[PDB]
Amino acid sequence: NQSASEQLQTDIPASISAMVLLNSACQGVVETYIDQGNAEHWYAQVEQNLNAVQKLVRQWRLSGNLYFSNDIMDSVLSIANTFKDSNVQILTLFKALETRFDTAQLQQLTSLILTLQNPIQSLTSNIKRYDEGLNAWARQVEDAHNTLQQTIAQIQQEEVSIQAEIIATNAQIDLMKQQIAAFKTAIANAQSQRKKGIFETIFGVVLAPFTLGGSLILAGFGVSSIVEAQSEISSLQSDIQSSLNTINHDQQTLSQDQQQIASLNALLLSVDQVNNDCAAISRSLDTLQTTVLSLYNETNNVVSNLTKAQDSQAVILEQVWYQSAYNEWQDILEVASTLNNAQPQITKAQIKENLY
Amino acid sequence: NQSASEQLQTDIPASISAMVLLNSACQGVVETYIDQGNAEHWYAQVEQNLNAVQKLVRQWRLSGNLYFSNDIMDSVLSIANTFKDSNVQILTLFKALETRFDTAQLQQLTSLILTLQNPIQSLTSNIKRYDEGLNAWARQVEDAHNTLQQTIAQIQQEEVSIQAEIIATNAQIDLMKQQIAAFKTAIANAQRKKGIFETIFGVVLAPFTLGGSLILAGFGVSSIVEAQSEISSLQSDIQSSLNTINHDQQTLSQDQQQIASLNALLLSVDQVNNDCAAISRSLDTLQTTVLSLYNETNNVVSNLTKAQDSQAVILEQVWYQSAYNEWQDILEVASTLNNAQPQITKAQIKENLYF
Ligand SMILES: [Cl-]
Ligand SMILES: [K+]
Numbered sequence: 195n196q197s198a199s200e201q202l203q204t205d206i207p208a209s210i211s212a213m214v215l216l217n218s219a220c221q222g223v224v225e226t227y228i229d230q231g232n233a234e235h236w237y238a239q240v241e242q243n244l245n246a247v248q249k250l251v252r253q254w255r256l257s258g259n260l261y262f263s264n265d266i267m268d269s270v271l272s273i274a275n276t277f278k279d280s281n282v283q284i285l286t287l288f289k290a291l292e293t294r295f296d297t298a299q300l301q302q303l304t305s306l307i308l309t310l311q312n313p314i315q316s317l318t319s320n321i322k323r324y325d326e327g328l329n330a331w332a333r334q335v336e337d338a339h340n341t342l343q344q345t346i347a348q349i350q351q352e353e354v355s356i357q358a359e360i361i362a363t364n365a366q367i368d369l370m371k372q373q374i375a376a377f378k379t380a381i382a383n384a385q386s387q388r389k390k391g392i393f394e395t396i397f398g399v400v401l402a403p404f405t406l407g408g409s410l411i412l413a414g415f416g417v418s419s420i421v422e423a424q425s426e427i428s429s430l431q432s433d434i435q436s437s438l439n440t441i442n443h444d445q446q447t448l449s450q451d452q453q454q455i456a457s458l459n460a461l462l463l464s465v466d467q468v469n470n471d472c473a474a475i476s477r478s479l480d481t482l483q484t485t486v487l488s489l490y491n492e493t494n495n496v497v498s499n500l501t502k503a504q505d506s507q508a509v510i511l512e513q514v515w516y517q518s519a520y521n522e523w524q525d526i527l528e529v530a531s532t533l534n535n536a537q538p539q540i541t542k543a544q545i546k547e548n549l550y
Numbered sequence: 551n552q553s554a555s556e557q558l559q560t561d562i563p564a565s566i567s568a569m570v571l572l573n574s575a576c577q578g579v580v581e582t583y584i585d586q587g588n589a590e591h592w593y594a595q596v597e598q599n600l601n602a603v604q605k606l607v608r609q610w611r612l613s614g615n616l617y618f619s620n621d622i623m624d625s626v627l628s629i630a631n632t633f634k635d636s637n638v639q640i641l642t643l644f645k646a647l648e649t650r651f652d653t654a655q656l657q658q659l660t661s662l663i664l665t666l667q668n669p670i671q672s673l674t675s676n677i678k679r680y681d682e683g684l685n686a687w688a689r690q691v692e693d694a695h696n697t698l699q700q701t702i703a704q705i706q707q708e709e710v711s712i713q714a715e716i717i718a719t720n721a722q723i724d725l726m727k728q729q730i731a732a733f734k735t736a737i738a739n740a741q742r743k744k745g746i747f748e749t750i751f752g753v754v755l756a757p758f759t760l761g762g763s764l765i766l767a768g769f770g771v772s773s774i775v776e777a778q779s780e781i782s783s784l785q786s787d788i789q790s791s792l793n794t795i796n797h798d799q800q801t802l803s804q805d806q807q808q809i810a811s812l813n814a815l816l817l818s819v820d821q822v823n824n825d826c827a828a829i830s831r832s833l834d835t836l837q838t839t840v841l842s843l844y845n846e847t848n849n850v851v852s853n854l855t856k857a858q859d860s861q862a863v864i865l866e867q868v869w870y871q872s873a874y875n876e877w878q879d880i881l882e883v884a885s886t887l888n889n890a891q892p893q894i895t896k897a898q899i900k901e902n903l904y905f
Contacts, residue, residue, distance in 0.1 A: 224580065224581070225580075227608045227611060227612050228612075229608075229609060229612050252583045252585075253585060255583060255766065256583050256584075256585050256762055256763060256764070256766055257761065257762035258758075258761035258762035258763070259762075260898065264761075404614075407613065407614030407620060407621070408612055408613040408614035408615075409612060409614070410612070412611065412612055537895060538895065538896060539893070539894075539895070540894035540895065540896065541891050541892055541893065541894060542891075542892055542894070543891070544616065
């Protein structure tokens with residue numbers, strides 16, 4: 195139903211969106227803080243495990259990863275600019291060949307179409323290279339997540355006297371994960387409708403609070419979008435606020451020391467977003483790779499048809515594919531350029547007890 | 551000549567501005583990253599010293615300190631809302647007392663003025679408590695800074711064959727400190743619609759040829775007024791200093807660049823130290839002005855008590871009306887800052903001449 199270039203209009207920003215989300219999730223991990231307070235010796239293992247996750251995120255940043263893959267973005271722009279720089283020449287040849295067929299100009303037209311294949315293959319190579327490095331890192335983050343999750347589960351299983359409050363708290367943290375997923379789905383549905391940019395919101399959820407201010411836990415997570423999304427991010431903040439209010443109600447019978455134990459799985463919110471965002475990137479790059487290959491095959495079929503053309507009628511029927519692809523790649527150039535030149539707009543939202 | 555409320559129109563946002571700067575300096579500390587690479591045994595001590603500074607920042611934030619003191623802000627809003635809610639009552643009593651001197655109405659007006667004193671004293675108390683906690687924390691950060699600085703100094707002393715490159719690098723790091731100071735000076739000069747605007751810089755040092763680096767040295771600046779021209783000049787300044795560092799380190803291996811660049815780790819810790827001192831200076835000014843306002847209310851309540859004719863009461867209305875007008879502006883500025891969501895940008899500063 196769609197040409198490859200038409201599909202890429204969706205698949206390219208979909209992949210950039212997934213990468214931007216990972217960047218914001220990484221920031222959420224960095225901005226997750228805990229203090230020992232009066233906690234028993236279990237705290238050392240939680241601190242160690244959390245620091246291991248944070249070390250992986252710092253190494254990802256130190257390796258140069260920011261909002262999206264520069265190599266993939268540059269390859270997209272290379273294809274788009276190859277279309278842009280050859281359009282007048284290609285249309286002039288089509289019109290000349292429409293008037294009078296001659297093999298020399300047909301050979302020149304075929305050579306111009308062929309100049310697309312190197313930038314396309316470069317995009318495929320850079321997607322593969324990026325996804326391999328991403329997956330190698332993601333496996334380490336997943337292992338670090340599982341270790342922290344197991345450490346916390348062991349601690350909470352030993353607190354037999356407050357099991358009901360721990361279960362109720364963990365249900366609210368699961369709801370928060372659902373609310374975050376609902377935000378991402380809402381954004382994805384409205385991406386094609388709005389102007390492009392880089393927008394990030396880092397949340398901090400205050401748990402086990404002190405009366406006079408501050409807390410023992412500041413549980414972070416990060417979300418983002420490549421389109422303005424003030425309404426959706428406000429609904430998410432309202433959702434997380436509601437869930438935190440319910441946690442505070444469910445923990446009303448707990449001391450601050452018990453709240454510290456009962457709230458530990460909020461530390462997984464940040465790294466869970468990293469895990470989910472890594473998987474989303476890889477799914478989007480599998481889709482993108484299939485579509486890029488489809489575009490490569492289209493150019494091969496067009497070149498094959500042009501080489502077989504013996505009259506003007508056979509040459510000009512390839513013009514519809516070209517004109518359609520050029521129009522799509524002109525739009526891809528605008529979107530990719532906007533994202534590549536955008537100044538990221540970041541904000542922070544601290545979520546704490548709302549009702550007193 | 552300025553009334554205390556007129557002075558507070560400047561002194562209150564001045565203190566808020568100083569607090570917002572400290573948050574951005576703290577963010578720069580948190581976003582300073584190093585990896586060991588092939589570094590020798592000195593790396594453990596640098597990493598431990600840096601982690602000690604970063605732990606202090608995390609503890610400061612876990613104590614509830616973000617962009618500004620919530621206790622001080624809420625006390626400012628408490629005074630402003632006391633003026634707002636009492637205004638119509640006070641103005642009508644002044645008007646009736648003007649027409650005909652009434653003893654009962656005078657005591658009511660006096661009691662309405664006295665209601666200002668409780669929130670004013672709570673502001674003084676909340677300034678003292680915050681500043682005491684700030685100074686206690688700032689002494690820990692200063693001690694942590696000096697330890698990391700001494701560790702770096704000793705490491706750089708032992709690399710005898712590349713002293714020229716280390717001295718040149720440290721000179722440019724000092725230049726960056728002056729360039730940051732120039733931004734904050736320009737901000738203190740230029741008074742538009744308020745907000746919370748923050749920029750976090752990351753300076754790439756000892757880079758890998760294919761991307762990334764062993765050092766990402768952070769620092770942060772901020773303002774409560776938009777300052778796009780000022781932050782653009784700062785970025786251009788920092789970019790030029792980093793380009794000079796890369797030129798001056800061209801003879802160094804990546805391992806040597808790692809050592810030669812270590813003092814960049816002190817950039818945002820140094821900003822924390824400077825910003826803590828600047829907050830305390832602004833809080834001493836603020837506390838003096840708030841005490842001046844408290845004494846103004848004591849002079850007015852005594853004048854209302856000593857008053858025995860109508861003209862003596864209207865004499866105190868000029869103070870009230872002037873105070874109220876200033877505090878309605880303060881309510882608008884404080885509400886804008888208390889309700890603001892931070893507008894944060896980030897800039898990575900790396901070699902930008904080749905590509
Ligand atoms: Cl656009
Ligand atoms: K409780």
